[PDB]
Design a protein around this ligand. Sequence first.
Ligand code: SRM
Ligand code: SF4
Length: 535
Amino acid sequence: RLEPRVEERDGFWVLKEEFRSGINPAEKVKIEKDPMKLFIEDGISDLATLSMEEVDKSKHNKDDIDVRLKWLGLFHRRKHHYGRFMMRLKLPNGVTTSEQTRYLASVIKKYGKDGCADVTTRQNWQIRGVVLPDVPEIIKGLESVGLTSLQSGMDNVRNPVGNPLAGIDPHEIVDTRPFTNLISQFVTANSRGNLSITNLPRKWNPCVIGSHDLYEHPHINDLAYMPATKNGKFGFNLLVGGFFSIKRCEEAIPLDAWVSAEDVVPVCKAMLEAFRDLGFRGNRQKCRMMWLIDELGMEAFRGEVEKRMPEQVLERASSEELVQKDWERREYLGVHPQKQQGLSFVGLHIPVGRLQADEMEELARIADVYGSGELRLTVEQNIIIPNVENSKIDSLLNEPLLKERYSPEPPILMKGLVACTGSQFCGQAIIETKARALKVTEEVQRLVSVTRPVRMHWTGCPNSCGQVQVADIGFMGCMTRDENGKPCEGADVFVGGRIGSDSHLGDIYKKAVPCKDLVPVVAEILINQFGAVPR
Ligand code: SRM
Ligand code: SF4
């Protein structure tokens, strides 16, 4: 045991025969045909042929559409958008150009009532509505503007998140951009696909911290790079194993490793390989990297990463940390000064992250006209317009879709509002979230007033995409039954989760609250635990 269970064969990575025992349905799909063959052997061109009738006629085509295709970031919404797809990108740091968002808006347009977009909770774009016939043209389209959507989906490395203010931030510990990009470019082998790394046992979330506020939520990632100097030289201490699941939630923990700026990619490479090689591949809810870790114990696991890297030395964690523990999270919504003299950024609302095609164009145009032609997406499903001259602020704050839809200064509960895709499009969802979230917040601001910023997170199912455990107040979809037995959408309410340097995970606080009784419960928590007032 601790002998690598996957080897290279004819260019692709595959689980050896003798380690094939308990393996789950996803592991059987991967074996039957490496999903990357859809992109590498252009299997994708043949997929754009099939009508949906033909696809569902055979078990192999139905795996491709529903599973394999996730490696090309294409997610079939079988239950809710049959024959249409949600497409997930690769966007290190949340940085997107106005050409990108424009190009995205144009792909969206083509579906009218059936296209929209979303900022995800890893500051990523999701596009909605696509159909197979369009994919080959959309991949060319995304490549021609900087994006790839490669490996965004199953057992790959997910969007590397960084500080949303990377490179414009007045109090910035390290510009995070190079590192998230370095990682993104590494994993994706420059949009060409890194096969050594697409046969993991499970998803894997990386992040890189550059802000004292810890906007990058290091505690919630499989690998979290934490700024600390070692010998004059700058670098990161490694936090490891953080994750949410149906069955388990674990906060990331020190690996006790320091790594220099140059060694960032190397460790990530080494650690992905340790995972790929050694991770469990049976029951799927025991497959995220943390399980491997407690199975071997920390040291033995460090040993495993250590021995996997260039010189086979992994330096120990340094005591010289750069993030300042006693620190209060800055608001980013609104007008804020940059570190560049005479420039400000403007954080914009984005109700629940949802955007339409017409509105995406306007942001893009506003970025061009006021800023540097770019935008910063953020983990609270909002976007910041960076680099505007202070002269232009006034006019900018006077623009139609800033007054109307995407406010720089929304009401206070909206400011920290986050919600997952929900049952509007997501096959997995127990409740509808995005609309329900705006309705419940609405009625809550009506009934109480709060001064403290408060973070509410809706998630539609225990997968916790919406990160209920990090929220002040959280909402996990469940179904409930009336005293008459009538099925009503409802949510578990989580209280007490904490963000930043003194992070904590929230606890179920009242179980199975039905959707009609939801507002009272929230109000009563607001007044009792967040100094809110009636009226
Ligand atoms: C878009 C997003 C929700 C959102 O509205 O923002 C998302 C979308 C999906 N998540 Fe997620 N997850 C999203 C953040 C998360 C997070 C938060 C994070 O990464 O910081 C987590 C927890 C972190 C973690 O992994 O521990 C998360 C943990 C999951 C899991 C649980 C993994 C597990 O071991 O149980 C699933 C189900 C799975 O993978 O087995 C899941 C499954 C899904 C699927 C693919 C479900 C499905 O089959 O369709 C959702 C796609 C729904 C759709 O059509 O939009 N999603 N999901 C967020 C992803 C943005 C991105 O670029 O990746
Ligand atoms: S939390 Fe559940 S309902 Fe929401 S996007 Fe994730 S899997 Fe879907």
